[PDB]
Symmetry: D2
Subunit: 30 residues, 4 copies
Amino acid sequence: ACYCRIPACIAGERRAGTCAYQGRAWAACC
Amino acid sequence: ACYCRIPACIAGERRAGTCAYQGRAWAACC
Amino acid sequence: ACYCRIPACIAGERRAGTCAYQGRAWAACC
Amino acid sequence: ACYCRIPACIAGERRAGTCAYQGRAWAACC
């Protein structure tokens, strides 16, 4: 599936949404 | 539906999930 | 703050993120 | 960080939040 990162997705991935945990918003990278 | 708040939902509401925007995680209050 | 809707935000609002509750992804409308 | 799954996290992981993408809510597993 998809992995949560900040500040943005890395090479090979593309951003498809967000995650929410530990108080912040993360990019969901798929 | 549901309204995003921090740090928590108010009287009359119940927490049902999360929101993610402006870099942070908010409670979704229903 | 912001209100969760599907399929999209209404006039007067702008989409700023997502909400997650009851199993689905909602627009966070601010 | 954390990986998005449905319906729930697997052994070795803990649920810390949610992900939102492709229209659905996923568990964020850390």
